[PDB]
Amino acid sequence: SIAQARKLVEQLKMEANIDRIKVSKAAADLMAYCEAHAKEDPLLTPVPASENPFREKKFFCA
Amino acid sequence: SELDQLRQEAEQLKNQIRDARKACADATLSQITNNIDPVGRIQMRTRRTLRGHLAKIYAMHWGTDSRLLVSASQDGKLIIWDSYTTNKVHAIPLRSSWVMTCAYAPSGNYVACGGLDNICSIYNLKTREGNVRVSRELAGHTGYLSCCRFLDDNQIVTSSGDTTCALWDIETGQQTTTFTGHTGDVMSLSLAPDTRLFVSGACDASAKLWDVREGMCRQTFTGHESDINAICFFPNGNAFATGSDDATCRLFDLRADQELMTYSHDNIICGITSVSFSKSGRLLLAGYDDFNCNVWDALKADRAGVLAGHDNRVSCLGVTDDGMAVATGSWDSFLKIWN
Amino acid sequence: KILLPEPSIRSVMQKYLEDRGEVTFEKIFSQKLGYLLFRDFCLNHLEEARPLVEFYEEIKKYEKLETEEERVARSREIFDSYIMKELLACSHPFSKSATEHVQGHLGKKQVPPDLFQPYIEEICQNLRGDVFQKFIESDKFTRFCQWKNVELNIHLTMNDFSVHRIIGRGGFGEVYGCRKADTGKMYAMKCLDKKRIKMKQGETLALNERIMLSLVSTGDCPFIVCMSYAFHTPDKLSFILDLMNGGDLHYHLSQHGVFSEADMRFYAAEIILGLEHMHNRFVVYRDLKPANILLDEHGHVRISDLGLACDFSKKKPHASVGTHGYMAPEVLQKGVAYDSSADWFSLGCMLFKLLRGHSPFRQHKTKDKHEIDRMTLTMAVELPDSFSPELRSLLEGLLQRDVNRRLGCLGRGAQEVKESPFFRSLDWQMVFLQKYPPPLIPPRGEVNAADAFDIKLLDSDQELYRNFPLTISERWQQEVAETVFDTINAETDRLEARKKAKNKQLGHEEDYALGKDCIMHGYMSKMGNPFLTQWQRRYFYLFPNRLEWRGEGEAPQSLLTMEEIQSVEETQIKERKCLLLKIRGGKQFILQCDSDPELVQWKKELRDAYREAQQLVQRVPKMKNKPRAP
Ligand SMILES: O=C(Cc1cc([C@@H]2CCNC[C@H]2COc2ccc3c(c2)OCO3)ccc1F)NCCc1cn[nH]c1
């Protein structure tokens, strides 16, 4: 189909004409994000039993 | 001819995209993160087992309170669970047996689900009276409902076997925007933290980034060798991960417009069903058809740990918004909550 | 006594009947129990249909009215009546044209019993469509399903009959007076012995008797011993028939001696209507003789034993079949085809024996079988001068050797015989209604009144009788209707009301099958592992991707997925058919159903649902099995 193939061209032109950053900078940003949030991540930084809703505890709210 | 030429200019545009991506590939995530310590051995126990589905579980979704969750099963029900006590807050028998997906609205007022009925059904969890009712049956897809996620109580995004996604106005029951572009069944979707963008993963082995408000495909990501079954945004919105039938997960960056990392091991040969990040984005957790959940260092690519608590496929998973736990759901009819 | 299955039986039965095209207005309305439940539905629960059905029943009563004076009176009452007016009051009245035909025959004083037939037809065209579909939706169709489940699960044995004195004896067996225990209805049981049948090579005879009884037993003929049931036990064949405890006419001829013209005329008229019934169904009887005429306690008679009868709708018989002194020429000649012709000749021989004491071709007590035949083929019979002229005209009519000249073969059948001078005194409708006084009222308890003048069972022997059991639907439904239907329905109504209140105090609506995509539901019995489990009765719900089951007092907590099912097969466990489901991982799941239609339907539905589910799952990337080893 010629309508389809022209649609593909228009689409690819939208995809091509975007601003891209360097991988080295994109990667540094992900790393910095993980580092700023490492201490608030309980799967990473295991919490004391007393702060952990799923250990040593029967009395809950709602 | 015209068709000869439009194909050739498409191919040439694909080369220019490829060339401009390579021009950005000045280093790797793996090189950039060489100096940070490994996360060590990630080890968790099963803190709850959620029993009550009578057959395979296909999906799950946490409420925003990090406490309730909704699961969907081959038994033709949704169950809404209180993960803290393990009690069933609601058990919802569906109109169609063939449910495949489910979603918890951020407010906690609705769930949604659907499957081979090709419908996204919306359930009002607290009526005027205090009953659980179907409040809307979103009809319009031409093939199965694969995933659905609420933006708010009046808007939801769906993906489908008909190769499209859509944005729905729940009140009118109508598709407000249709996202067309995939050439295979769309299997999964994930909303950006700000809900202006979403990404989809499909059986054409690509992921696409969509503008919610304006209706277009902004970027297309390739590299998987086979179906993408699952997708999830990295928590700052600038990257996302996919899981595929090719036995790999991958990390894609939006602004660099390319793949940053592959997460795989020569001993893992089956498909990934499900992906989610830990609260900080440092861990990528994925479910596998070999009955495990593997936990990856998202920055460094090493396998950090394994959750091995199911007797059949891990079909779904999710990390709570408070980061405190991970839920796994399985073909063995159980969910487990781990930390 | 009859215990109806519960209303949820409908889930299986509705489907089983729809699959056979049996849930139409015509199929249900023409069954006696179907009609009774539809009537109940219309009179009591659907205002728009009630007058149609009341009118319909008035006409049904009108049809059965014996005198022309009664029908002049009643036709006028019906026309001048309130139901007639109710029907113009509604916006579905009778047509100008039907009304004109009726009121035209009325004003000219002529009142046939089918006077109101165009009204019947218009009523039925209006019962067709929405009113019928509303019946199907109602509890009265549910109740039809309950009765129908019982009808289609009948397996009679000796223990279902309280069996009493011998009322007939033959070479193959005996007949008994008996009472069917569940309804109290009285019948004859003709009990033929298989050892004795093997010994005398009459298997095709026993079997032909059954097919012939089937062809003949609908329509409630008052002049043939018809069948309600056939069944068999390891040593016996058993036919359940119209009770005739007055002995046969071979015995009564020998006790009373010969019969007057008037006496024989009673017997002949009754016999002629029996033959008419048979010939209208393209059956030739062939063995008409006095030992095959039986009497009831009142002296009314019926033709019995269709062993030697034949169906001529497709292929006219050639063979020499009968008893030697009553067989027609065109029969005795092997390779001359014949139809009902044969019975009219045989009738002639028989009406002669009742008058004279011997067949007209057995002269001096003689038995030369070849000579009896030569007399039938050669000499016309001299009729003694003492016979009336009307009787002479009749026997000369019936005994013509040439079929082309013979009374009853000139192309109008029995009607030719009925018009004979000999019967001028008779009203044939009165014959039909058994209104004429019989000549001989048998003494009560008369012993030996129906005697004829006189090794192992292989599995190949049993194999010949495979398709012997049979229930005549119309006969069972009439039995039930006239005995226990009303009382069972009331009791059953009360039982269901009671389970309903109790269910609601408990907080239990039996609603688990509703609002979902459940295909079918009902009771079955289950077994798993043969060492670990035993038969447990549970309530099953079939959904497109799984089969769930529950005990009493909880919702389902167990199931098999359609995915796990590899095959569904019939199999025998202790003389009882079960379903064997082979499950992935070499396990087994076995099912026993409570009735024959349930086993047929659960088999078909399970098979359909597992095959469709598996072909569907294979197309869905998220649900299908994926490779786990290279
Ligand atoms: O024994 C029978 C059938 C039979 C006949 C009779 C009677 C023999 C004498 N003529 C009347 C017959 C029928 O007797 C009946 C007596 C009472 C009845 C009844 C039939 O139906 C309803 O109530 C009694 C038991 C029977 F089993 N037929 C043998 C045919 C044969 C073949 N080779 N040799 C002989």
Ligand SMILES: [Mg+2]
């Ligand atoms: Mg012949």
